[PDB]
Design an enzyme around this catalytic site. Structure first.
Site, short mmCIF file in Angstrom:
data_model
loop_
_atom_site.label_atom_id
_atom_site.label_comp_id
_atom_site.label_asym_id
_atom_site.label_seq_id
_atom_site.Cartn_x
_atom_site.Cartn_y
_atom_site.Cartn_z
N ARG A 134 1.29 -11.65 2.07
CA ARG A 134 2.36 -11.99 1.44
C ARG A 134 3.57 -12.10 2.06
NH1 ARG A 134 4.08 -8.90 -4.51
NH2 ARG A 134 5.77 -10.52 -4.95
N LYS A 175 5.41 5.09 3.51
CA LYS A 175 4.65 3.92 3.61
C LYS A 175 4.96 3.36 5.08
CE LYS A 175 5.64 4.08 -1.33
NZ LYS A 175 6.53 3.53 -2.22
N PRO A 183 0.84 -1.28 -0.11
CA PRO A 183 -0.05 0.11 0.08
C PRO A 183 0.90 1.10 -0.13
CG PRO A 183 -1.11 -1.63 1.65
CD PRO A 183 0.63 -2.11 1.15
N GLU A 184 0.31 2.54 -0.80
CA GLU A 184 0.98 3.71 -0.77
C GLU A 184 0.54 4.53 0.20
OE1 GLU A 184 1.20 4.30 -5.13
OE2 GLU A 184 1.20 2.08 -5.04
N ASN A 242 3.87 2.64 -7.13
CA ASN A 242 3.63 2.43 -8.53
C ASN A 242 2.39 3.07 -9.27
OD1 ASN A 242 4.65 1.14 -10.86
ND2 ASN A 242 2.89 -0.29 -10.89
#
Length: 261
Positions: free
Chosen positions: A108, A59, A1-2, A168
């Site tokens: 993840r 972040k 997440p940004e 991104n």
DNA sequence: AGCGTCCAGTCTACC
DNA sequence: TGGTAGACGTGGACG
């Protein structure tokens, strides 16, 4: 997440968890994510303390407690915060004196949870560049530094050292809005485009925060909504989207609007 | 769930 | 330089 995603979690905690003693702690026995301390020690430490405030930079998010050391979270690719199991992917869990539960997951396993006396003086926060939302480079400044860089504009935006918070998809969105090819060199930007990137970065990141990073509330005309589509079938306002890699990240852009010299 | 393949913020090895 | 090409565990989307 940004930045948006983390900023939302910070606000949520600043609203529901401040001033309550931690009654129960559970730290995932994950050698990779729980960094620099045994889940056991980490548990004994914060137990019984109270969150005094939730802080953020880039972040990264950490919880200032009534006494150090403080728990910090580097989200990574899949880090996430939950308030209200312990979910299967929970790495940090606490139940406050009012039954309220707080949990940091990472399906993840690319995140970093640490327990530092002062997250502000050490990695990764110490090397972080100014925050996109807390210390926005003034129009002039922004450009001024944009000059001093002979790097591609995007990987420049994905550099936490330069500026912190952009990710991104946020990078793609702002370059698209400001109609700037991701591969255009920084220094080779016009003081006109520099003021254009500056303005989109602000519009994009704010609206994103404003909607608690709920992507569905994102302005329909953002490229974001179609960056998921496959090459050859991805479009925005009839214009075609191209997928090239930069900074080692799949970059969506529109050749018909984003050009370069 | 069951298949198989592909896409998806750091951090280091290297030309 | 800075550009890059990969590695790192693993879920979720999809042919």
């Amino acid at each position: 997440p940004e930045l948006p995603e983390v900023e939302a979690a910070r606000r949520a905690i600043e609203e529901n968890c401040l001033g309550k003693k931690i009654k129960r702690v559970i730290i995932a026995d994950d050698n990779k994510v729980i960094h620099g301390i045994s889940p056991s020690d980490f548990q004994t430490s914060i137990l019984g303390k109270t969150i005094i405030s939730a802080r953020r930079k880039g972040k990264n998010l950490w919880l200032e407690l009534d006494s150090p050391p403080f728990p910090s979270f580097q989200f990574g690719m899949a880090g996430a915060i939950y308030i209200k199991w312990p979910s299967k992917y929970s790495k940090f869990f606490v139940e406050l004196d009012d039954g309220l539960e707080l949990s940091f997951t990472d399906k993840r396993r690319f995140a970093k949870v640490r327990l530092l006396a002062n997250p502000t003086s050490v990695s990764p926060i110490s090397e972080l560049g100014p925050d996109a939302l807390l210390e926005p480079m003034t129009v002039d400044e922004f450009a001024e530094s944009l000059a001093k860089k002979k790097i591609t504009i995007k990987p420049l935006l994905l550099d936490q050292g330069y500026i912190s918070g952009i990710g991104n998809w946020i990078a793609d969105e702002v370059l698209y809005q400001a109609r700037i090819h991701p591969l255009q060199t920084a220094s080779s930007l016009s003081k006109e485009q520099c003021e254009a990137l500056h303005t989109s970065i602000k519009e994009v990141i704010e609206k994103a925060v404003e909607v608690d990073a709920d992507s569905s509330q994102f302005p329909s005309n953002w490229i974001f909504h179609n960056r998921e589509k496959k090459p050859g079938k991805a479009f925005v306002d009839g214009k075609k989207i191209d997928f090239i890699t930069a900074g080692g990240r799949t970059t969506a852009y529109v050749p018909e609007l984003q050009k370069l010299y």
